[PDB]
């Protein structure tokens, strides 16, 4: 959709500001912190299925997940479409490779952000993002050796 584009390719679109964070907070995390796009898509789809099963659960994070899942679906369908006009799966594979390379990390940050908001609570995530940013920006001379850990909620 129009959102989509604006967020994926340049512009001035911070999808996190409405939820109380900033692209800069999410950009502090190393990439290995996040699971794969397809792993996060599986989790996000489970969470959206539960918000459909019980409509009281629903929240903005669910709608953001839906939209993320659909943007990704849109790009995959664009790849499959390129894999028809040029009749060969190698072209499709190249488009999917380009998407993963250039936007993969953006999708993983976004998906983890709402997934983790829904499973740890928004405030836990927000505080954790600040802690990791503080730690990453601390001069290595005085900062603790282990970065902050996000701990799972006690049941």
């Amino acid at each position: 959709s129009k959102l989509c584009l604006g967020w994926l390719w340049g512009m001035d679109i911070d999808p996190y500001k409405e939820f109380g964070a900033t692209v800069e907070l999410l950009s502090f995390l190393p990439s290995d912190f996040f699971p794969s796009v397809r792993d996060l898509l599986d989790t996000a789809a489970a969470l959206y299925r539960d918000a459909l099963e019980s409509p009281e659960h629903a929240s903005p994070h669910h709608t953001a997940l839906r939209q993320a899942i659909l943007c990704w679906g849109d790009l995959m369908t664009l790849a499959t479409w390129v894999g028809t006009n040029l009749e060969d799966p190698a072209s499709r594979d190249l488009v999917v490779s380009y998407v993963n390379t250039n936007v993969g990390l953006k999708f993983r940050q976004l998906l983890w952000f709402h997934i983790s908001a829904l499973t740890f609570g928004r405030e836990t995530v927000l505080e954790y993002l600040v802690s990791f940013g503080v730690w990453i920006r601390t001069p290595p001379a005085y900062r603790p050796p282990n970065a902050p850990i996000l701990s799972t909620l006690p049941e």
Partner: single-chain antibody
Amino acid sequence: ELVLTQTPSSVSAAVGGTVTINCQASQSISSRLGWYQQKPGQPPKLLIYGASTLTSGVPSRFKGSGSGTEFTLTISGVQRDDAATYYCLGSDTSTDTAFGGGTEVVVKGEQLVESGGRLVPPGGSLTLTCTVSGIDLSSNAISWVRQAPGKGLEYIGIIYGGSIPYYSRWAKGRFTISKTSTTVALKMSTLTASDTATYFCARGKSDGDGYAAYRLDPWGLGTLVTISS
């Protein structure tokens, strides 16, 4: 739903012969496959990750190949030190990640500590702990794998630096992986004789797309969990 079919189940070779183990995936997994070697009384050891990339120290006589659905491990100069059981580990997603059944190879002529294993009654519940040292728990995954006595490796689950857990379809609901600042814990409930096993945690290391579950190293020594009436 990933199934890895490893063949043959056992191979005898002479020192200097060549050993060939094939692994067939039921879905395309690209190159996300490891090869593991396990000697009696020891934890598994990662030989090869990404289907062809040898870990440091592994002799050149080992070579992995394949991608998609077809993979091969070949030991050319096979030596007495290579006698062992070998297992392939495929990862389609971190949920659909599975070991092959293993191949016994007979030849002729940074720290992890599990704890909490004990005798447990049928249908009871138990939590295992894995204490992590020299490993940043915010950028490395921790995986749980189990081995019933005299049987192969079974993938339980993994949890990423960003603390999203993933479970194989068979563990989903009876097993829960949690994380503190220093530990990764595995809680299992409804325990049956089928759960008696040694339980290993291992560090998963992500590729560029973030898949960690097929590259597991180092390993802990395991903790034995025995269901007894």
